[PDB]
Design a binder for these strands. Structure first.
Ligand code: MG
Ligand code: MG
Ligand code: ZN
Ligand code: ZN
Ligand code: ZN
Ligand code: ZN
Lengths: 162, 162
DNA sequence: TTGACTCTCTTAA
DNA sequence: GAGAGTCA
DNA sequence: TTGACTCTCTTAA
DNA sequence: GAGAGTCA
């Protein structure tokens, strides 16, 4: 098994490589009508992506390092969390983008939580709009708002009460 | 079926059958420290479910009727909305449970909206906690809360800024 | 050891 | 959150 | 005609 | 949101 020192070395090489990705400045809603700025370190759209990186899906990548003749591979956003527990409450931990920008690999924009927690950030009002996430959101979720419901609750007769 | 009269007759038969489902009272969080009461009309756990109903998955059912000698079949929660547009902004409209109770077929607990709007209600603070859904929630979403994040954003070196 | 592709899978609406 | 087929 | 089962699919994290 | 194979 890789030692803790070897894992730290993987994290360090990952950070060195991601730190050289293009840094894109994004203005974002924070909630409460306020605007903030996030700086995303974005993996390229096409190969080459950076040392150790390869695309396994339209917006999926992996990081690969060969240590003592053994090939090791990780989901590209999971590397910051290799020294953390990988499950909680019986649920697998997932890399969760606080910036909601899948190409971003900035570890200051990532957290490590259940898929339900991850998804729920899409609708959060944001750090200045009422976020209650214990690990606070960096921005209002992209899907926050009144929604676009086509039809509401209704009945034709009198068979039902709410 | 094709005619508006045929569609209304399908809605009316569906309402009459679902109206005979057992009515189960559920006390629910509303947000803001308040609690409310919903009356769900719950399809039975096992066959027979009711005239026209059959189970196609653990928590999936379909409603079927024979019209002009042809069988017409629908997802069991979609029937109230058969006269509504079946898409919005190019996204498929889905039956969305405001009571978050899949066995419930009370149309006063259903709306018709994109799958994203549907999902997002799981995290809504609720009608007394700040819900901004234009078609208002009936309860706080079951997944609302601080979450259980295992690790937050972090870096080992000095290559990243928020 | 490394890059650039390929494939399928998980979850819960 | 969906559609459709196999039997009786 | 109606009932009770079977199977796979969609979406976007 | 994931893991794993092939080829040079
Ligand atoms: Mg996410
Ligand atoms: Mg729902
Ligand atoms: Zn980012
Ligand atoms: Zn939040
Ligand atoms: Zn209900
Ligand atoms: Zn709401």
């Amino acid at each position: 098994a890789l030692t803790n020192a070897q894992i730290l070395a993987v994290i360090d090489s990952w950070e060195e490589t991601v730190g050289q990705f293009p840094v894109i400045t994004h203005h974002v809603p924070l909630g409460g009508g306020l605007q903030g700025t996030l700086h995303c370190y974005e993996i390229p759209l096409a190969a080459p992506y950076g040392v150790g990186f390869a695309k396994n899906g339209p917006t999926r990548w992996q990081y690969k390092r060969t240590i003592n003749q053994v090939v090791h591979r990780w989901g590209s956003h999971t590397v910051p969390f290799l020294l953390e527990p990988d499950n909680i409450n019986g649920k697998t931990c997932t890399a969760s983008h606080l910036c909601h920008n899948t190409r971003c690999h900035n570890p200051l924009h990532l957290c490590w939580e259940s898929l339900d927690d991850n998804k729920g950030r899409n609708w959060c009002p944001g750090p200045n709009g009422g976020c209650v996430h214990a690990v606070v959101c960096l921005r209002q979720g992209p899907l926050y708002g009144p929604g676009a419901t086509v039809a509401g609750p209704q009945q034709r007769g009198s068979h039902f009460v709410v």
